[PDB]
Amino acid sequence: ASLIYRQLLTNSYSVDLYDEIEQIGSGKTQNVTINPGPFAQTRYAPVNWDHGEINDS
Amino acid sequence: RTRTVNLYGLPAANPNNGNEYYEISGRFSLISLVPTNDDYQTPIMNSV
Numbered sequence: 001a002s003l004i005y006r007q008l009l010t011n012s013y014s015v016d017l018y019d020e021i022e023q024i025g026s027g028k029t030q031n032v033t034i035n036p037g038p039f040a041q042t043r044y045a046p047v048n049w050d051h052g053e054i055n056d057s
Numbered sequence: 058r059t060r061t062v063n064l065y066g067l068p069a070a071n072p073n074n075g076n077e078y079y080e081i082s083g084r085f086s087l088i089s090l091v092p093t094n095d096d097y098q099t100p101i102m103n104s105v
Binding site (some may be wrong): 034037039042043044045 | 098
């Protein structure tokens, strides 16, 4: 059971290796592509307000 | 000073009657169809 202390001290180099893991995995580019769901969006339209038809003569 | 007298209506000669505007008040009920979500369709980490 004392072997755990020896293993930790011996394998401590994996700490620096893990530091490299994380601090270059952050450097590497990742992009979680959140979707649009199966249900699709849509806006009304380009709508502009104006005065209606005028009865000229 | 003319024939046509005592007729019911409103001619176009001077409808403003010297008033800047004719005003009307009322209530306005609209039942439009919004595009608004229901707080679903939004990513799982939608939070502080």
